[PDB]
C-alpha cells in the first residue's frame, strides 16, 4: 500500500520576494542583500527549506502529533523524517517573462533607514525577484501502512498550510511587502505506487 | 544609421566636426550653435527616452513623428542648427527608427551630442 | 670574534652543551662567508659549511663504527678517494601529512598550528636522539617536510623502521589518520654530491618516491585489525592555548600537550627548573640562550589586541573609518618548485648544493617566521600562522593592506626578485567566525593565483590586480591624488565619489560621454578659485577614465572605494 | 555486472563528516542504507537483505556521468575521475582537467526564533548533464526501490529539497563490462568503498595501494526515540588498486545494544587494468 | 480556534501626487533626475509596504511613546507589538503586515484621457546670492491615482484585549498619514494620501469584525 502522490503547484509572486543570500562581500553601490540563487544558471529560487520551515511555522500557530508527522522530530521514535519532501523551486515562466518585456529577472528595490532625531537616512539596496515570476512547486507526500487512517487528516493540513502561506509573506523581508505569493493549479498525483488521486483533487481547487 | 558601437563615436566626431567662430578671439573656438538651440532639442529626445520605457512603440509614434517636424523647423531658422543636422545627421538617424531599440538609441545619440558639445566649450 | 671569546671561552664541551653551541654559530657566524675565494661557490656561511661538516662528519663516524673497520680511519680516507664511491649517508626525511586540514576561539588556532610546529621540531629532535646525532644532522624543517644526513648502516634503517612505526601508532593512539609521518630516505655516495647535476634530483627522486609509497600505503596489518573494533587532548589544547604567550617550552614526562611516545609539552616562563627534557626557546635564540639544552623554534609572534577588537579599532584619531576587520593570505607563488628546482636555471651543470637548498630553506624559515614579527611591528594585528607555504593574518584593515604591502616590498628587496608571492585581502564586519573567512580569503587568494600569480586580490573575486601595479599604481598613484583633491577642498564631497564609482562600475561607450558632461558640468560650479585645482582632477579622472587598456578603470575604481572606506564616519 | 544507474540530481547534498562539507559522490555506504531504508518503508526489507546476502548482488560507488561513464582514478599507477575511455590512455601515462562537475557551494540558513541556529549547508549543485550512476545487479525488487528512491531522495538534508533525483537505467558499454569481474587475479582496482574479510586483509595490505576513508556517523532509526552514533570503522576507498580481487563483506557497525541491525555495504565490485 | 487572521482594505487615493524615490541612480543627461519606484512588468507607479510602514510607524511614534525614543527598538510596547521590535523577545515576528500597493484604476484614468500615470514636475533652486536658478525634473504619480492598500493583522490566541486595543491604533495611525505626507518631498507638496473605503475582514476565520467595521465609520 507503499503510494507517493507528489503535489505539484505553481508559485506565482504577487509581491516580489527576496529569500536571502549568504553574507559575501558587498561593494559601495552595489547590492546589499542579494537573493539566493542558482550558481550555474543565476536564476532567482526558492529553497524547499524555506517553504518546510514557512509552513511549518504557520501550522504550529494553528496545530498547537499532527505536525510532528509531517515536519519530522529528531525525538518521538515513530516520526522521525516524517511524510514529506520539499523541492527547491526554479522559475517556471522565464520564457513568459521574456515575452512580456522585463530585462531582468530581479529588481532591485532601493530603501532607507531614517534614524529617528538626528533624522538623518541611511540607504540600503536589497534584490527582489520580480511579481510574475512563477516558480515550479513540488511537495511529495508519502502512504504507508502507518498513512492509511491518517492520510486525509494530512491533507487538510497541507492544503490548510499552503492557504496560510497564501495570506502570509514567504521567505524574507516581509511584514513590510516582499512575499505575497499565490498557489496555482494544486494538484495531486501518484508517482509511485496505486493511490487514488480523484479523491482529493475535489477536496483540492 | 547608427549601430549599437558607433553612434557615441559619431557624436564626438560630428561635434568636433561643427564649424566654429574664426571671428574674435575672446575665447575663440566657440561654436555659432549655441546652448539653448540644442538644448531644446535634446528637451524632447529625452522625454521621449523617458517614455519609451514605460509606454510602448506603437502608442508614442505621434511624437515620434513630430521629432522630425522639430529638427527640420530648428535647422530651418537659424542655419547654425542646419550646420548640427548636416554634420551629425538627425534626418537620416530619425528615417530610421523603426525599433523601440533603435528609438532609444537615437534619443542617446542625441544626449552623445550635447554632452561633447558641452565637453568641447 | 670576541663574541665568540666571550660566550665561547668558559665551556665545558660535553654532550649537554652539544646544543647551544649551534644557536651561537647561527646567531654570529652566519653572515660571513666561507672560503671566499673567487671560486664558483661563493655563497655559503660558515655557520652553514660548519654545520654541513659536522653532519658529514658525524656519519661518517657512524658508518665506520658500525661497519666495525677503523684501523685506520686514515687508511681509506687521506691516502685513496676510492671511499667516495660507495653508498654511505642516507637522506632520511619524512612528512608530517594531515598538517594542514588538522589545524580547520582563534588565538586556539594559533596553539594549534603551533603545536603541529612542535611535532615537527620533536619528530626530528627525538629521531636524532635515537641515533647517535643531535641537530645539525638536519636541514630544512617547517612546515611539515625535514630533511637529514644519516649513517647508511644496518642499525639506521632499523631504528628508522622502528622509530617511524611508533610515532605512527602514537598518532594513531591521539590523532586517528588525521595525522601521519612517513620517512623515507635514499643512500648516496659521497662523489654524488661532489661533482651530478641529475643524480642529485634522482637521490631526492629516491627519498621522494619512499615518502610517497608509505603515504600511500599507509599502515601496518594489525593496526588496522585492532582499530576496527569532555575531552581528553583538546583539554591539553586549551590550556596550551593559554600558555601560548611564553617563551621556554619544555619536554616533560608527564606535564600535558603529548608530542610523542613518552613525551608531553608545557609552556613555561623562567619559573622553572621543574624537570626539563628539552628547552624549545622561542625566537630569540642569544638573550634566551642562558639555559643549557636550548634548541631555537622560529614561529609565532605579535598578537597585538583580542580579535574580537580588530574592527572595533580603526577608528583613527579624527574618528572616521569603517569598522571592518581583514585578513590576509599570502603565500609564495611556485615554492615546491623552488625548494628543489629554483638553482636549475644558471647552468645546465647546476648549482644546486646540499647547502645552497639548506641555506635557501634557512632563508626562507628566517623571513617568514621571524622577521614578519618586525613588519607587524606597530600595525594592530595578529599573525595566526606563517610558514611560506600560507601565511595568514587577520588584522584592522588599514594595517592589514599596509602589512601586505610592506611584506610584499620587504620580501622582493630581500629576494631581488626572481620569487614572489600572491595575496587575497578579505574584508569582513565584526563578530563573524573565522572558518567562513579563511576560506572566503582562501578563495580570494586563489583567484589571485589565477591570475599571474603575482598577483593581490583586494576584497572580492575580481579587483585581482598584479601585487607591483597595486603598489606603484594604486596606492602610491592614484589614492594619493584622489586624497590630495578631496582633502583640500570643500564643494564636493562623498556624493561627486559615489556618482563616480557608479560610473566606473557601469562603463558603457556611452557613459565615456555622460562622465565628461559631468565633470565639465562641475567644472563650472566650482568657486573660480578651485576651478583649477578641479580642472586638474577633472584630466586626471577622465583621462585614466577614457584609457582604452582597463588597467587605470578598475585600478581607480579600487582607488576610490578604499578612498570612501577610509572617511566614512559612524 | 548489469546495467547502470544514471541518477540526475540537481542540488544534491553529500555531507562527508560534517553538514557544511558535500563531496560530490556518495560510497555504497549510502546508496545501499538508502535501498534499505525504502525496503522497510515498504514491505519488503527481509528480500532485500536475502539479495543483498547472496553473492550476486553488487553495487558500486557513484561516479559522474556528464555523456559516458566515469571512473575513479587508479592510485598510484602514473587527478579523481577519468573517463570510460581514458583510462588505459591514462594509465599508460597522460594527462587530464578533473572535469566541473558541479559547484559546491554552501548556503546560510537559520533558525529564526531560536537566535543561536545560523548554519551552512554545503550543496553539490550538478552541471545541467552530469549524472551519477550505481552499477548493480538488475533484479525487479532492485528497480522497485530505486525508482522509489527517486521520489524520497538521496543524501542529507532531504526533506528540504537535498538529493531527489530521476532515474535512467542503461546497458553498460561492452569496452567497460569486459573489465567488471570479482575473481580476478592480475593488477585490479576497487570502484566501491569496500573491507576485506580477515584472511584477504594481508594480501590487500601489502601489495595494495588504496586509501582510508572514516566512515562513521548516526544511525537512521525508527525504534530508538534518541540518536546513537555508528561504530566508526575505516575502508578502503574507491580507485584503490589491489594484487588480486579480495572478498569483501557487510559490516554490522550497530550502537552497543541496539535492537535492529545497522549494516554497512563494503563487499566490492572491481575493474580490471 | 484561536487564531485569525484580519484584511484592513481601504483605497490609497492621491492629491498631489507622490514621489516615492526609486533609483539614485545616473539620470541620464536630461531625463528624470530622481524617478519613482516602479513595478517591472507593467511599469506603473507603486507604493511598496516598507515606506507606509516606516512612514507610519515614525507618525505613530509621536502619539504613543510617553518619552522620545533614539531608535525603533527603544518604541513602547503598544507599537512594538504591532511594528515588530528586534531586541524584545515577545515583539519579534509581530504583528502587521503591509503589502505594497499597486494600481487600482489604471483604466479609470484611461477613461479619463489621461497620457501617462507618471507627471514629471519641473522644479529649480534659487540660490540666495548671485540668485542662480539650477533645474529639477522629479517624476511623481498623477493626482486622482489609486492605489490598493491591504494590511494583514494576526490575531493570536495571547491578546484578548490588545486586538480592539490595537484597531484603534491602526485607525488612528491611517488618520495621521491623512494629516502628514507619505514618501513624496512632503514639505513641498507631494503627499496628501486618503484613505477610502475601510474595511476588515477575516481572511482567516473565526473573529467577529462587526464591530470594527462599524468602527470604522
Same mark, same amino acid.
Given at each position: ?205 | ?121 | ?570 | ?116 541556529? &545560523? !548554519?551552512?549547508? *554545503? ?6 548533464? @552530469?549524472?551519477?550512476?550505481? %552499477?548493480?545487479?538488475?533484479?525487479? #525488487? ?90 566508526? &570503522? !575505516?575502508?578502503? *576507498? ?6 588480486? @580481487?579480495?572478498?569483501?563483506? %557487510?559490516?554490522?557497525?550497530?550502537? #552497543? ?17
Amino acid at each position: 500500500t507503499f503510494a507517493k502522490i507528489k503535489f505539484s503547484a505553481q508559485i506565482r509572486l504577487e509581491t516580489g520576494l527576496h529569500i536571502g543570500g549568504s553574507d559575501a562581500f558587498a561593494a559601495i553601490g552595489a547590492i546589499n542583500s542579494p537573493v539566493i540563487k542558482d550558481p550555474i544558471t543565476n536564476l532567482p529560487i526558492i529553497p524547499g527549506s524555506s517553504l518546510k520551515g514557512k509552513m511549518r511555522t504557520l501550522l504550529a500557530k494553528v496545530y498547537n502529533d499532527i505536525l510532528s508527522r509531517l515536519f519530522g522530530n529528531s525525538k518521538d521514535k515513530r516520526f522521525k523524517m516524517g511524510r514529506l519532501i520539499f523541492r527547491d523551486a526554479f522559475l517556471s515562466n522565464a520564457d513568459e517573462l521574456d515575452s512580456l518585456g522585463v530585462r531582468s529577472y530581479t529588481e532591485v528595490k532601493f530603501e532607507n533607514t531614517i534614524d529617528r532625531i538626528t533624522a538623518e537616512a541611511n540607504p540600503r539596496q536589497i534584490e527582489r525577484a520580480i511579481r510574475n515570476s512563477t516558480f515550479d512547486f513540488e511537495l511529495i507526500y508519502e502512504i504507508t501502512d502507518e498513512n492509511e487512517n491518517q492520510v486525509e487528516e494530512d491533507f487538510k493540513v497541507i492544503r490548510d498550510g499552503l492557504k496560510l502561506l497564501e495570506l502570509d509573506y514567504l521567505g524574507g523581508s516581509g511584514s513590510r511587502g516582499y512575499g505575497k505569493v499565490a498557489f496555482e493549479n494544486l494538484k495531486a498525483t501518484t508517482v509511485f505506487g496505486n493511490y487514488d488521486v480523484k479523491t482529493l483533487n475535489e477536496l483540492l481547487t | 544609421i547608427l549601430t549599437d558601437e558607433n553612434y557615441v563615436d559619431i557624436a564626438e566626431k560630428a561635434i568636433l566636426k561643427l564649424e566654429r567662430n574664426t571671428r574674435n578671439r575672446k575665447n575663440p573656438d566657440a561654436f555659432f550653435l549655441t546652448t539653448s538651440k540644442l538644448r531644446n532639442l535634446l528637451s524632447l529626445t529625452s522625454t521621449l527616452f523617458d517614455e519609451s520605457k514605460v509606454k510602448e512603440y506603437d502608442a508614442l509614434l505621434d511624437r515620434i513623428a513630430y521629432l522630425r517636424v522639430q529638427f527640420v523647423y530648428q535647422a530651418g531658422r537659424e542655419i547654425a542648427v542646419k550646420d548640427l543636422i548636416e554634420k551629425a545627421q538627425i534626418l537620416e538617424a530619425l528615417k530610421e527608427i523603426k525599433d523601440r531599440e533603435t528609438l532609444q538609441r537615437f534619443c542617446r545619440y542625441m544626449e552623445a551630442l550635447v554632452a561633447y558639445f558641452k565637453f568641447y566649450g | 670574534a670576541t663574541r665568540i671569546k666571550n660566550e665561547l671561552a668558559e665551556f665545558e664541551f660535553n654532550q649537554v652543551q652539544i646544543d647551544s653551541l649551534l644557536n651561537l654559530f647561527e646567531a654570529t657566524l652566519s653572515f660571513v662567508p666561507s672560503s671566499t675565494n673567487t671560486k664558483e661557490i661563493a655563497d655559503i656561511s660558515l655557520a652553514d659549511h660548519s654545520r654541513l661538516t659536522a653532519a658529514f662528519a658525524l656519519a661518517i663516524y657512524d658508518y665506520l663504527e658500525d661497519k666495525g673497520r677503523h684501523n685506520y680511519k686514515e687508511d681509506l680516507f687521506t691516502k685513496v678517494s676510492a671511499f667516495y664511491e660507495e653508498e654511505a649517508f642516507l637522506l632520511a626525511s619524512f612528512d608530517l601529512s594531515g598538517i594542514q586540514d588538522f589545524i580547520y576561539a582563534a588565538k586556539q588556532l594559533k596553539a594549534r598550528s603551533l603545536y603541529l610546529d612542535f611535532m615537527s621540531e620533536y619528530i626530528a629532535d627525538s629521531l636524532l636522539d635515537k641515533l647517535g646525532l643531535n641537530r645539525a644532522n638536519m636541514l630544512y624543517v617547517g612546515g611539515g617536510h625535514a630533511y637529514f644526513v644519516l649513517a647508511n648502516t644496518e642499525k639506521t634503517v632499523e631504528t628508522l623502521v622502528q622509530f617511524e612505526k611508533d610515532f605512527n601508532q602514537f598518532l594513531l593512539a591521539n590523532f586517528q589518520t588525521r595525522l601521519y609521518v612517513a620517512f623515507g630516505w635514499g643512500s648516496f655516495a659521497a662523489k654524488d654530491i661532489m661533482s651530478s647535476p641529475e643524480s642529485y634530483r634522482q637521490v631526492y627522486q629516491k627519498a621522494s618516491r619512499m615518502i610517497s609509497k608509505k603515504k600511500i600505503s599507509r599502515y601496518d596489518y594489525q593496526t588496522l585489525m585492532l582499530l576496527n573494533r569532555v575531552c581528553d587532548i583538546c583539554r591539553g589544547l586549551y590550556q596550551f592555548s593559554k600558555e601560548i604567550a611564553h617563551d621556554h617550552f619544555i619536554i616533560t614526562e608527564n606535564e600535558g600537550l603529548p608530542i610523542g611516545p613518552n613525551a608531553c609539552l608545557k609552556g613555561v616562563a623562567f619559573e622553572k627548573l621543574s624537570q626539563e627534557a628539552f628547552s624549545r626557546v622561542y625566537v630569540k635564540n642569544d638573550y634566551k640562550a642562558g639555559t643549557v639544552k636550548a634548541t631555537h623554534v622560529f614561529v609565532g609572534d605579535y598578537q597585538c589586541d583580542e580579535i574580537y577588537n580588530y574592527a572595533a579599532l580603526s577608528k583613527n584619531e579624527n574618528g572616521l573609518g569603517i569598522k571592518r576587520l581583514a585578513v590576509v593570505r599570502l603565500d609564495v607563488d611556485d615554492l615546491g618548485a623552488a625548494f628543489m628546482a629554483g638553482f636549475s636555471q644558471q647552468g645546465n651543470g647546476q648549482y644546486s648544493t646540499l647547502s645552497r637548498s639548506a641555506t635557501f630553506s634557512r632563508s626562507m624559515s628566517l623571513f617568514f617566521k621571524v622577521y614578519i614579527n618586525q613588519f607587524a611591528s606597530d600595525k594592530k594585528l595578529s599573525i595566526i600562522y606563517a610558514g611560506g607555504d600560507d601565511v595568514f593574518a587577520i588584522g584592522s584593515w588599514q594595517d592589514i593592506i599596509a602589512f601586505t604591502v610592506e611584506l610584499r616590498e620587504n620580501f622582493i628587496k630581500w629576494t631581488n626578485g626572481k620569487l614572489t608571492l600572491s595575496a587575497g585581502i578579505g574584508l569582513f564586519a565584526d563578530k563573524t567566525p573565522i572558518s567562513l573567512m579563511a576560506h572566503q580569503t582562501g578563495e580570494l587568494e586563489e583567484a589571485a593565483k589565477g591570475n599571474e600569480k603575482d598577483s593581490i586580490s583586494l576584497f572580492s573575486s575580481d579587483y585581482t590586480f598584479k601585487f607591483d601595479r597595486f603598489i606603484t599604481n594604486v596606492y602610491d598613484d592614484k589614492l594619493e591624488q584622489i586624497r590630495y583633491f578631496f582633502n583640500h577642498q570643500d564643494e564636493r564631497g562623498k556624493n561627486f565619489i559615489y556618482k563616480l564609482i557608479e560610473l566606473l562600475r557601469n562603463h558603457d561607450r556611452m557613459n565615456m560621454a555622460r562622465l565628461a558632461y559631468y565633470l565639465t558640468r562641475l567644472e563650472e560650479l566650482t568657486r573660480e578659485t578651485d576651478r583649477d585645482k578641479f580642472k586638474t582632477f577633472k584630466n586626471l579622472f577622465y583621462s585614466w577614465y577614457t584609457n582604452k587598456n582597463d588597467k587605470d578603470r578598475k585600478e581607480a575604481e579600487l582607488a576610490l572605494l578604499l578612498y570612501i572606506y577610509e572617511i566614512r564616519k559612524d | 555486472t548489469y546495467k547502470l544507474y544514471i541518477m540526475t540530481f540537481q542540488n544534491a547534498h553529500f555531507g562527508s563528516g560534517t553538514l557544511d562539507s558535500s563531496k560530490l559522490t556518495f560510497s555504497a555506504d549510502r546508496i545501499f542504507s538508502a535501498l534499505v531504508l525504502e525496503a522497510l518503508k515498504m514491505g519488503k526489507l527481509d528480500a532485500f537483505l536475502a539479495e543483498a546476502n547472496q553473492d550476486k548482488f553488487t553495487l558500486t560507488d557513484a561516479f559522474p556521468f556528464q555523456f559516458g561513464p566515469f571512473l575513479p582514478k587508479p592510485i598510484g599507477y602514473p587527478l579523481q575521475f577519468l573517463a570510460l575511455e581514458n583510462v588505459d590512455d591514462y594509465l599508460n601515462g597522460e594527462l587530464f582537467e578533473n572535469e566541473e562537475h558541479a559547484v559546491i557551494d554552501t548556503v546560510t540558513k537559520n533558525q529564526p526564533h531560536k537566535d543561536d541556529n &545560523l !548554519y551552512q549547508v *554545503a550543496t553539490t549543485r550538478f552541471s545541467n548533464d @552530469t549524472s551519477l550512476y550505481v %552499477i548493480a545487479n538488475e533484479s525487479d #525488487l532492485l528497480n522497485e526501490l530505486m525508482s522509489s528512491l527517486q521520489y524520497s531522495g538521496l543524501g542529507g538534508k532531504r526533506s528540504s529539497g537535498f538529493g531527489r533525483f530521476e532515474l535512467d537505467i542503461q546497458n553498460i558499454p561492452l569496452e567497460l563490462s569486459d573489465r567488471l569481474t570479482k575473481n580476478h587475479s592480475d593488477k585490479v582496482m576497487s570502484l566501491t568503498t569496500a573491507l576485506p574479510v580477515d584472511a584477504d586483509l594481508e594480501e590487500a595490505m601489502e601489495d595494495g595501494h588504496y586509501l582510508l576513508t572514516k566512515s562513521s556517523g548516526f544511525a537512521f532509526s525508527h525504534a530508538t526515540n534518541e540518536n546513537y552514533r555508528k561504530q566508526d &570503522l !575505516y575502508k578502503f *576507498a574507491s580507485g584503490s588498486t589491489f594484487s588480486k @580481487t579480495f572478498e569483501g563483506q %557487510i559490516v554490522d557497525v550497530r550502537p #552497543l545494544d541496539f535492537p535492529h541491525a545497522v549494516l554497512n555495504y563494503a563487499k566490492p565490485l572491481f575493474f580490471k587494468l
